[PDB]
Amino acid sequence: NTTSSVILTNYMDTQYYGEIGIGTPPQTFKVVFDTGSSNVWVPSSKCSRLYTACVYHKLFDASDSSSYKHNGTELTLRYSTGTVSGFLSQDIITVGGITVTQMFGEVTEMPALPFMLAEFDGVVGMGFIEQAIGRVTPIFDNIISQGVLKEDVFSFYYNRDSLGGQIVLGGSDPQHYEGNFHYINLIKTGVWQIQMKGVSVGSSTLLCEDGCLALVDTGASYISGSTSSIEKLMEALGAKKRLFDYVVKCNEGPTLPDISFHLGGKEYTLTSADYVFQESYSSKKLCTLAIHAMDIPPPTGPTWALGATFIRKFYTEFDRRNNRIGFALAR
Amino acid sequence: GNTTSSVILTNYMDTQYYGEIGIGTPPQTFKVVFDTGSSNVWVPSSKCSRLYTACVYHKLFDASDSSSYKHNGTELTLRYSTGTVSGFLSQDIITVGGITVTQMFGEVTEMPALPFMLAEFDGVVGMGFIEQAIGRVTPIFDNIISQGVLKEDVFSFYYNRDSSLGGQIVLGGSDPQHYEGNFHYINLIKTGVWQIQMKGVSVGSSTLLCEDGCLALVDTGASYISGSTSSIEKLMEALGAKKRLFDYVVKCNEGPTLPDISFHLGGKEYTLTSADYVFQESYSSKKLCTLAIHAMDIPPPTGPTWALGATFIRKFYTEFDRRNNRIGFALAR
Numbered sequence: 001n002t003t004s005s006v007i008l009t010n011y012m013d014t015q016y017y018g019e020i021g022i023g024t025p026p027q028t029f030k031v032v033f034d035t036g037s038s039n040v041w042v043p044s045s046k047c048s049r050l051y052t053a054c055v056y057h058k059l060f061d062a063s064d065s066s067s068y069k070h071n072g073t074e075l076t077l078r079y080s081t082g083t084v085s086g087f088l089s090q091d092i093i094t095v096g097g098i099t100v101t102q103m104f105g106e107v108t109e110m111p112a113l114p115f116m117l118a119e120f121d122g123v124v125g126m127g128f129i130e131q132a133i134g135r136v137t138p139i140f141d142n143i144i145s146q147g148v149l150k151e152d153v154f155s156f157y158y159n160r161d162s163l164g165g166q167i168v169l170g171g172s173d174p175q176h177y178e179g180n181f182h183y184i185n186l187i188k189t190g191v192w193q194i195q196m197k198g199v200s201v202g203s204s205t206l207l208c209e210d211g212c213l214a215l216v217d218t219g220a221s222y223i224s225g226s227t228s229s230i231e232k233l234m235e236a237l238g239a240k241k242r243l244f245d246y247v248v249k250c251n252e253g254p255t256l257p258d259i260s261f262h263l264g265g266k267e268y269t270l271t272s273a274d275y276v277f278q279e280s281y282s283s284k285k286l287c288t289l290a291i292h293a294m295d296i297p298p299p300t301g302p303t304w305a306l307g308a309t310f311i312r313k314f315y316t317e318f319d320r321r322n323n324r325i326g327f328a329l330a331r
Numbered sequence: 332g333n334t335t336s337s338v339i340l341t342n343y344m345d346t347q348y349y350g351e352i353g354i355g356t357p358p359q360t361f362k363v364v365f366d367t368g369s370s371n372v373w374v375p376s377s378k379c380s381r382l383y384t385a386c387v388y389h390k391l392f393d394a395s396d397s398s399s400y401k402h403n404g405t406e407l408t409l410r411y412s413t414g415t416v417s418g419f420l421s422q423d424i425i426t427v428g429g430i431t432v433t434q435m436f437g438e439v440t441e442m443p444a445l446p447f448m449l450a451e452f453d454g455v456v457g458m459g460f461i462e463q464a465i466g467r468v469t470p471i472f473d474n475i476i477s478q479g480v481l482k483e484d485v486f487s488f489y490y491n492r493d494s495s496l497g498g499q500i501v502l503g504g505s506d507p508q509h510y511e512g513n514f515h516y517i518n519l520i521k522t523g524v525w526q527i528q529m530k531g532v533s534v535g536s537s538t539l540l541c542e543d544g545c546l547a548l549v550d551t552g553a554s555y556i557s558g559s560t561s562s563i564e565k566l567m568e569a570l571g572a573k574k575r576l577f578d579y580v581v582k583c584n585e586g587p588t589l590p591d592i593s594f595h596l597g598g599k600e601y602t603l604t605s606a607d608y609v610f611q612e613s614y615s616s617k618k619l620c621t622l623a624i625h626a627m628d629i630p631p632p633t634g635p636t637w638a639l640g641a642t643f644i645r646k647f648y649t650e651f652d653r654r655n656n657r658i659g660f661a662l663a664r
């Protein structure tokens with residue numbers, strides 16, 4: 001019976017990473033926990049000094065984990081934000097309390113933009129075996145294997161910028177949501193994607209009636225749409241593009257409509273407050289939105305994806321055993 | 332025997348963790364610190380001259396309202412690492428969460444404003460052993476233990492990342508809703524004090540410091556992790572932080588990059604990443620955020636020691652096991 005709770009760090013509301021320890025003795029890295037992919041990886045005490053990205057991070061030393069059993073496979077993880085390439089090996093990862101012996105990637109090649117913007121070191125994928133590049137069996141399907149935690153559900157709390165945020169493997173941590181869940185169902189097992197039958201703005205449904213797809217990605221900073229969805233949405237908030245990104249001007253952020261994401265029956269609404277990055281109400285300044293365009297490519301893509309922005313407002317729970325997702329007001 | 336009481340605590344800015352005791356019949360309630368570095372109990376006294384303006388700003392024990400107060404009057408002076416208080420003895424019934432003890436305590440009559448003008452708590456409930464209690468005033472935990480009440484002769488401290496309950500002490504056990512993983516116990520070097528042998532602090536990668544060994548008192552009534560000036564400043568050299576008089580300070584936009592500090596308590600490696608020890612009020616180029624580790628030299632009564640205060644208890648649930656004279660740490664949640 002377990003609830004293993006991993007406490008997270010909220011770095012500027014653009015990224016929340018918590019920590020695993022790998023090896024015996026454990027070597028701890030800060031990692032993001034990603035429901036949009038399935039492979040666990042950390043940098044290697046091997047990663048080329050010329051990837052400022054290796055240099056900078058923390059690096060796994062395969063020769064200090066007594067328990068380490070190498071394997072070899074050149075792994076190539078193409079992520080929607082950049083592609084890392086390393087080689088596969090085995091050790092003991094400690095998650096919270098739990099201890100799983102898990103094959104992971106040792107990243108060797110690591111392309112600086114963006115993993116040097118990564119304030120973290122690696123990713124644990126809470127995704128599916130079906131997404132796992134090279135059928136390496138993911139940590140949750142594997143922790144599940146040993147049968148220790150008490151429900152195979154795991155949930156995410158992301159806090160506003162303090163606690164920071166937590167993952168609870170085994171159930172929900174009830175102090176951080178209010179009311180009871182209402183679940184939405186996976187379209188097909190293999191992805192934590194669900195169906196939005198619309199995105200409204202204030203009142204009027206603007207797009208995505210005759211619904212479009214929703215990836216629920218905990219390893220994502222924002223709400224994302226296709227360039228042109230996001231276009232029409234910005235176009236309606238009044239928000240305008242500055243150079244990179246869209247802004248609105250701070251004193252007017254109170255004015256903006258709500259977006260409402262109609263997920264299966266219910267409506268998950270977000271106010272200006274939840275999506276405008278409000279460093280003041282100054283009349284004299286521009287304030288960024290936390291909704292962003294990002295083209296996800298088509299295995300998985302092209303899809304809208306609900307990352308941190310959504311999850312700060314709604315506690316999410318990933319009900320692995322019923323292949324569905326729950327949401328409740330987070331607090 | 333069998334009982335567990337739990338005291339609840341209020342967390343003021345991860346710096347002050349105070350709970351509340353009731354002394355007297357009727358009870359005068361006082362906000363106090365449950366301190367494992369000292370072993371006397373004291374509260375400000377009605378007789379404190381209000382020229383000490385800490386006594387103007389605190390709540391005082393007016394002993395002519397307790398029907399139970401038993402005079403005793405021996406003066407004692409309490410010399411803490413941060414400042415000294417002086418006063419005399421008294422006896423009355425203190426309540427420490429449900430449990431009731433008659434207890435000899437100090438009525439403090441001279442309370443120097445620095446640093447107690449700065450303290451949200453009114454007094455101290457020393458949780459140490461009798462070998463460090465000034466004047467042998469048999470410590471509150473030995474009194475509850477002679478009462479035959481508790482399920483186990485242990486107390487546990489849970490200090491919470493501030494922001495709903497601030498923390499919780501359990502008397503007689505350990506609450507497994509605030510720890511995960513298994514306990515890890517480190518034995519005491521001597522009986523008399525909650526101090527354990529520690530070998531090597533690691534900044535980032537290599538055992539930078541306390542290589543061969545040094546002591547670590549695990550003091551719940553202290554906000555920071557302390558180390559000897561002669562040793563912290565080298566740790567501080569490495570982290571590259573600045574001295575600003577009483578604390579250390581780093582340019583705020585560095586914080587979230589500063590290398591993990593690791594502690595080697597008795598056979599495992601307890602580790603703080605840079606959230607754990609950095610008071611991130613900003614991510615600016617300007618603004619200096621404060622590191623929550625700073626130097627301070629505990630005097631050689633209790634050796635010169637590293638003191639592991641609320642920055643470590645905040646991550647590892649601590650069970651002070653008096654019964655086997657050892658301290659166990661586990662993960663907090």
Ligand SMILES: CCCCNC(=O)[C@H](C)C[C@H](O)[C@@H](N)C[C@H](CNC(=O)c1ccccc1OCCCOC)C(C)C
Nearest residue numbers: 015016036037079080081114117118123218219220221
């Ligand atoms: C198996 C190959 C992946 C297939 N699936 C995908 O690519 C999904 C569309 C999305 C994918 O999971 C995506 N979440 C990956 C993320 C993206 N991370 C970054 O690119 C990243 C780098 C620097 C700074 C921030 C970044 O995002 C962190 C967001 C997490 O904080 C909540 C991983 C690497 C932590």
Ligand SMILES: CCCCNC(=O)[C@H](C)C[C@H](O)[C@@H](N)C[C@H](CNC(=O)c1ccccc1OCCCOC)C(C)C
Nearest residue numbers: 346347348368369370411412413450463551552553554
């Ligand atoms: C029995 C006499 C032995 C004295 N020995 C010692 O001085 C010990 C080594 C340290 C001692 O435990 C020390 N921690 C005492 C504490 C320290 N507190 C303060 O100095 C202090 C003053 C103002 C504001 C806060 C302070 O710290 C409280 C921190 C507790 O919150 C976790 C007392 C005065 C409440």
